[PDB]
Amino acid sequence: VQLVQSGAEVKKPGASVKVSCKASGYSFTSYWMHWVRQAPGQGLEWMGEINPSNGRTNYNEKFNTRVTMTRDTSTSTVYMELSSLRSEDTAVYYCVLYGNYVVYYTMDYWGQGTTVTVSSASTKGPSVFPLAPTAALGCLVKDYFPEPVTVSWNSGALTSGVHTFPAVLQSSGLYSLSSVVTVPSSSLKTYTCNVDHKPSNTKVDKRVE
Amino acid sequence: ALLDELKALTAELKVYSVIQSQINAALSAKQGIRIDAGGIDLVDPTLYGYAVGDPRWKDSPEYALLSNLDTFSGKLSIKDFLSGSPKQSGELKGLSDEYPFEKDNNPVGNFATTVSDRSRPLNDKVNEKTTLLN
Amino acid sequence: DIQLTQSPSFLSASVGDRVTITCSASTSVSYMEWYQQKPGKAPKLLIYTTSKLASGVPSRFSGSGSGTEFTLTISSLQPEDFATYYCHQWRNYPFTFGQGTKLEIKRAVAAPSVFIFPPSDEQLKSGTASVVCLLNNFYPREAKVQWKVDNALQSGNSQESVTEQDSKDSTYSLSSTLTLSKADYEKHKVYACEVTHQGLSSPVTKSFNRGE
Structure with a gap:
């Protein structure tokens, strides 16, 4: 069936x-x-x-x-x-x-x-901002609509210690999401978040530093 | 003990007679019969002598039987009743969702005897329990 | 309507544990059905007609009960059983569901590691500032975050969310975002998030000064 x-x-x-x-x-x-x-x-x-x-x-x-x-x-x-x-x-x-x-x-x-x-909101792609200071770093995926958004790190190669949080719905009607990864401080190696918001055709790669 | 058994048994037999009625009406018009969602709903007060809206319906033994079957979801096809439990006459398993009219060895006719064969012992019990009170 | 109330609403256990979840109906119902649900997936039927196992469901699961009181029992929890469980009746219109029972894995207490992130210069260019506070890999799930700007508590300008329990270490993580306009951001110096949790003898504050 x-x-x-x-x-x-x-x-x-x-x-x-x-x-x-x-x-x-x-x-x-x-x-x-x-x-x-x-x-x-x-x-x-x-x-x-x-x-x-x-x-x-x-x-x-x-x-x-x-x-x-x-x-x-x-x-x-x-x-x-x-x-x-x-x-x-x-x-x-x-x-x-x-x-x-x-x-x-x-x-x-x-x-x-x-x-x-x-929603009275209209389809819109997010802005992707770096989150920068064991250390933590991440990407702020902000002001998009509607859900969903996918985030990977280093083209999918980095999964360990990655946390991608549930989006929150802002009073504006737009969603905002963070994704972070924790690494040994001495790594600070290259870290890039890959964001894809299909409904708006916004596909973005952000190098975090 | 006996008196209560007769009430439940008679209600169960009543549902069988309603089913036989539908089958007979099909045999009379040379029609097949659906016993799935496209057949009648057996959860219908008017089939058992109750007016729509009569609050007595939900307290009837007919409703008590139908509404407690594993196959009951606010509604009941003829197949749901025949294959459902618990009832005194057990469960008929492997039935088809419909039986078409044929000129040779009519499926509706074979379905009719399958149902009547199943209700016969129930009817015997009812006669026999009725027979020891007069 | 028949209301179905499940207890407990939340339950912690370990792999190997035997657990029982109860569903209480506000009136008698002939049978109960039980579903499992995992994040981003449709509900999965486990038990039907009160006590029958759905095709392919492990014999670990069983159901029982009658009247108003129905139970789902899992004997010897496996890692894949940590999920949300719902009871459901389809006997009386409208068909109704329990509020759900969420089953999590027990773990030793872990204090959150806390990090704060200033707004990026790129965002400031746009007229808005978001400050983010990360509470990483803590247990148990309950945690409080307070935002302070120049030591003043903030209200109505922050939102947070929490991850599902981690598949490997059984911890939770939390992210909170403080959002101000750029001009408002530039009127204050000290930005701080203050974290309270069972794993911490005293609250942890992480802060930065806007100039530095």
């Missing part, structure tokens, strides 16, 4: 998002499909379900006026649309096949998830 979801999205407040979930490996119209979401740092919440044989739905009362689930049986795809988006809707959204299916087959299946970010 595979459940393949559409790619990450960014939306302004008030707008709507439509995520797809393409199903294979089981009788599509034989079982209900669910949606479950998870906001950053938080737990899981069930959003509702749809019966693909007939389009019938049941929604969590919390979302009942904002969510629309539909399906296309010909392509074995379910859609979840969520309207009047607010920042609290920033989350990973999963389509899920579980419930009675698990009794029959002894397992469930989840899609890989779709990150949806709702």
